[PDB]
Amino acid sequence: MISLIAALAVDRVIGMENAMPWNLPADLAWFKRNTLDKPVIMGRHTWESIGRPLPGRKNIILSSQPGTDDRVTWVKSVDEAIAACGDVPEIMVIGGGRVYEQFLPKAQKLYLTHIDAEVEGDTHFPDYEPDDWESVFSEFHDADAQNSHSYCFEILERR
Amino acid sequence: MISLIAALAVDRVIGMENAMPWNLPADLAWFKRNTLDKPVIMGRHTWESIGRPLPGRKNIILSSQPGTDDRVTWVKSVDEAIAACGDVPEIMVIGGGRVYEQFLPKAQKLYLTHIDAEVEGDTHFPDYEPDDWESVFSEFHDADAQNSHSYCFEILERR
Ligand SMILES: Nc1nc(=O)c2c([nH]1)NC[C@H](CCc1ccc(C(=O)N[C@@H](CCC(=O)O)C(=O)O)cc1)C2
Ligand SMILES: [Ca+2]
Ligand SMILES: [Cl-]
Numbered sequence: 001m002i003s004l005i006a007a008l009a010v011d012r013v014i015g016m017e018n019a020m021p022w023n024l025p026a027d028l029a030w031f032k033r034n035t036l037d038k039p040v041i042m043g044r045h046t047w048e049s050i051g052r053p054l055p056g057r058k059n060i061i062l063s064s065q066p067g068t069d070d071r072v073t074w075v076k077s078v079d080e081a082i083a084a085c086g087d088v089p090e091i092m093v094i095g096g097g098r099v100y101e102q103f104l105p106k107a108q109k110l111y112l113t114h115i116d117a118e119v120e121g122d123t124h125f126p127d128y129e130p131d132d133w134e135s136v137f138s139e140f141h142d143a144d145a146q147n148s149h150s151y152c153f154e155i156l157e158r159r
Numbered sequence: 160m161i162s163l164i165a166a167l168a169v170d171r172v173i174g175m176e177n178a179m180p181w182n183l184p185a186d187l188a189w190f191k192r193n194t195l196d197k198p199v200i201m202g203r204h205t206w207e208s209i210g211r212p213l214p215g216r217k218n219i220i221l222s223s224q225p226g227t228d229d230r231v232t233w234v235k236s237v238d239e240a241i242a243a244c245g246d247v248p249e250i251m252v253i254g255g256g257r258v259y260e261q262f263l264p265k266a267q268k269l270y271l272t273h274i275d276a277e278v279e280g281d282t283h284f285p286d287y288e289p290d291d292w293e294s295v296f297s298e299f300h301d302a303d304a305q306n307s308h309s310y311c312f313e314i315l316e317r318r
């Protein structure tokens with residue numbers, strides 16, 4: 001099945017012109033825990049942002065342009081991206097906006113990090129219908145010595 | 160000689176306990192490049208913020224309470240902290256607020272990172288009369304895909 005994993009600020013802001021104004025090592029630890037050993041599909045902008053390939057995961061870049069790196073798999077279509085994952089139980093889609101939009105309809109589960117930050121965004125997470133999803137796990141945390149803002153983990157399953 | 164290194168948001172606000180709302184990896188690289196191979200002195204909250212001994216540096220913690228960990232040197236007073244550094248060219252003071260206050264009088268250099276972020280905070284870096292200090296280096300950088308805000312590195316020398 002396919003899942004989407006994303007961090008959302010208030011109003012579902014997922015991206016800014018520049019780097020997000022928060023420091024959440026615990027959020028990154030949750031993203032790792034939930035994507036390790038799984039294939040991850042991402043757009044080119046998200047890739048360039050990352051820096052390098054995510055260790056221990058098969059990195060798949062969905063883009064219309066030519067691949068610039070031989071350490072990862074470049075695909076031109078959603079179907080292409082999926083086939084490239086092969087036979088696995090779960091496929092994680094990691095953004096950004098456009099990629100999330102394109103895969104939401106096929107998605108069965110959402111792993112979200114709601115962050116308490118009010119920011120002006122460039123891109124937002126597609127709108128999802130709360131009536132259509134079931135919250136199966138939620139966990140609130142306040143900001144602390146290593147995390148700049150308060151955040152909440154949530155996992156939802158399609159009804 | 161003694162130097163203090165700090166990251167200041169608008170109005171000289173500095174962290175108190177929770178991590179600051181920004182993400183500036185270029186600033187941590189500057190931090191590292193300037194403290195490596197030198198003794199660093201810090202207070203107890205800074206120490207929780209960091210979360211482990213900084214590698215390649217002699218870690219000195221000034222605090223009135225118990226020395227939890229064995230990997231660093233724990234002192235109860237300024238003089239005690241200084242002594243622990245031994246005979247070296249530069250001692251780096253890394254905060255927090257009170258620690259900065261205690262060492263400023265003795266400081267000969269300041270390494271500051273001015274960040275273009277409006278943050279509500281209780282603490283402020285000690286007021287330094289810019290006239291007793293000579294600004295010897297200043298370099299501005301805009302925010303980008305990896306750094307959430309604009310920042311400006313600056314070195315001041317006490318005259
Ligand atoms: N320039 C500057 N920026 C800051 O944010 C601070 C200061 N100074 N001085 C005080 C305090 C320091 C907090 C602080 C210091 C180091 C690391 C750290 O992880 N240091 C590594 C760098 C690792 C890296 O580049 O990720 C290091 O080895 O210095 C984190 C927090 C905060
Ligand atoms: Ca439930
Ligand atoms: Cl993208």
Ligand SMILES: [Cl-]
Pocket residue numbers: 201202203204205206254255256258
């Ligand atoms: Cl402190």
